[PDB]
Design a protein around this ligand. Structure first.
Ligand SMILES: [Mg+2]
Ligand SMILES: [Mg+2]
Ligand SMILES: [Mg+2]
Ligand SMILES: [Mg+2]
Lengths: 189, 189, 189, 189, 188
RNA sequence: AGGCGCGUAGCUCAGUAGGGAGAGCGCCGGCCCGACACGCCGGAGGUCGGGGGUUCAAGUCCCCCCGCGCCU
């Protein structure tokens, strides 16, 4: 009766998969072993599926995981989204673009007075700061769009460990859940 | 009747408005005089007009401009956009973000081998590279969305000296035009 | 009241445009002069316009052509075509694919017996046979699909000098016309 | 509850049926014996069954094969397809046709400087290159279209060793699964 | 699973040779087997009429109607695609032209023999007309009655004919092999 | 219907805990001879096949594309 759209952050972010076990290949295995007793459907987008399988390495786990989870792409030709989504997204992207320029300038001035020493450390700091400024708390990849559209079309409960995905998911129409509560709600059902 | 949607680039880009007259204000006056005798309608989004008035010294010409040209706002509440548009936009945004990160890394590495003096030239080059990498060939401001939605809603010919605006207007099916042929079109309509 | 989607062949095939004038750079001028008095709407796809302006040195006439004709791209995100248009198209392509392989083998055998000094004639014959066996009587380019969809969604009268496109336009229900009587139709409308 | 639409590649490709037994007849017999206990419905297009029976000699297997697998053709009279699918198919087909024409031109040149000796191996190389250039990675038959349409209509899990079929099925939103996992699914469901 | 029976199942010798080599024990064997298999057997009531006229069945009709079910398709609540009529019209026109050609050929061939061997010529014309206008196509209303009973019940059509399986495949209906009917019934 | 492997100077390759882009050869200067050469100083020689990603650092680690060969 209930459908759950899954994202790779469930099996990637440490804070969310610790419900089952304190190990990636143990938490995934425990999720597999008990999801077969749940009276619910599980759906994962196709793009995020191989994104997941290229991040984590599975042995005798891909067969069972494909058995319990139905991989399927959204039907991205009959789906429509409001024009207010585009406005907010483009304004947020423009706001975050200017912030990246400031960080780049600050790091190019900081490294401009070090005289060829510890420049690598400045680059390491710049990478983290720029990535956090540009790709944190927002939808950044087409995989997030795929998850959003699958949740929209299928009218399911989105289970995502991210933070920017939940914001836009609740923005459009999607019902969400706390990923820390998966092992309880999905066990009771 | 023929309806046109104007943009800032018509009076901003010199290559566009040189068909009227060499100087900006003279070209705008020529455009006003020609449009006062043309059997056609002209529109411009409210935010686009706001940025036009605060960028150009529109003195003694604002009354005539508001006379010939009608300033409107897109009705975003009753407008919907395809999902593939958002998909392509997000993919392009991610690609440009990666390009900007590469440019920032290159410029910070360059500035680390040049000591505390002459850093300003490196910063200026970093700005002129990052802005062109992240804002050329794509819709970046919320006024471009206003131009796109007003043209898509009024079924009007879009006039714009930009290149990303035309690129993303061909993606939705908006009638376009060459900005340098506008004058000859207005003298025969 | 009447919409006429145009194709490149109208200005490319000598027999089609001889109804206007004997020269390709004079027939277009006559068409623009006549279409300025016709009580009908004209349309050409964006890609078709790009291809037409690339194969013809449109100088001093492009403003006149854009004054009369409307350049617009189809909104293919909503249109649904029947599966029978795709099933009965895939078989034709596969049948033509096997024909090209036989032609290539025949020409390789024919070039292997002369063995010298005449490979150019064999190459030219292979080019012509391959082109006529895979690009004759069927829709091949993506511009033809653009014309088809623009005529379908606008419910317009297709005016194309092709035969491979006019045959598949009938398969959808598009009001086809004979391209050699465009001038008489325009002169009375 | 679950539905599986099979393709000929499941029993033809050695890398797929080796999970059953190292023998085509043995693999088919093992699949038939195992499918009699699983809680799933298997379907195959009629045009695909024709090709399957024309490539394998089934003795005492076809009566057993018809026991488990329900042969049925797609009901294509009421199955709309997206218009952008046709656009991608046309552009990719044109790309591959252009790629094969130059392959044929290269091979006729290579055979035109070798005399009447060793022409057969050149012809064989031309055949292999033409096949892999114009057929690999694309939908190239009406059997594949039947599998895709049947899977779309019944909302089933598409099983097929062909990768072009899966790649073009992902564009429509069909539940795709890895063929090599198929066996493990059957003893689990 | 539900099947749809036809006259050709019990009239064509190659079809009922699975049960017995006699068209009065094949039906008995089919009834005995169907009294054990877990399946539903349906046949249109317009098809059961032909099964009773062309075949004289006695002491077996009670068993048959006990183990088989008879119903007519509810054609008042059914729809047919519009391109079915196009294919049917084209095939009918082509077959009509072929039949006219055959009739002309058989008239010209007998116009040379004057009054001699006319009966054999007429018999040959009968056979040619039958095999050129009533083979490989739906011709009677008892064929549409089989097509619409499986289109509406989602059943596996069982028929020894060839013109039934050419148009049953054109509207997406399951198609069993008529010679294997005994085996699957044994396993179901 | 697929799986295995290779792409590094004028040619054929050695190249990895990621911390050089070189060589056996061809060979213009060189040594080497009264004398281009032999043993023997070395010029010159780059798309590490093309795009990206992760790292202070990529021929190396990770994905896509192109080309050349072996097994079904
Ligand atoms: Mg992701
Ligand atoms: Mg064309
Ligand atoms: Mg195939
Ligand atoms: Mg196939």
């Amino acid at each position: 009766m209930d459908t759950f759209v899954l994202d790779t952050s469930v099996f990637t972010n440490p804070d969310v998969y610790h419900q089952f076990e304190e190990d990636q290949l143990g938490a995934i295995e425990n999720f597999i072993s008990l999801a077969s007793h749940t009276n619910a459907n599980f759906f994962m987008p196709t793009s995020v599926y191989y994104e997941f399988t290229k991040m984590v390495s599975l042995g005798d786990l891909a067969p069972k995981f494909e058995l319990v989870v139905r991989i399927r792409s959204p039907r991205k030709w009959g789906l429509m989204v409001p024009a207010e989504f585009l406005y907010e997204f483009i304004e947020e992207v423009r706001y975050r673009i200017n912030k990246g320029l400031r960080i780049a300038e600050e790091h190019t001035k900081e490294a401009g007075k070090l005289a060829e020493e510890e420049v690598g450390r400045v680059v390491n700091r710049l990478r983290e700061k720029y990535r956090e400024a540009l790709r944190a708390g927002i939808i950044d990849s087409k995989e997030d769009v795929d998850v959003l559209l699958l949740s929209y079309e299928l009218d399911a409960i989105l289970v995502s460990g991210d933070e920017g995905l939940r914001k836009w998911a609740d923005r459009v129409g999607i019902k969400l859940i706390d990923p820390k509560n998966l092992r309880y709600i999905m066990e009771n059902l």
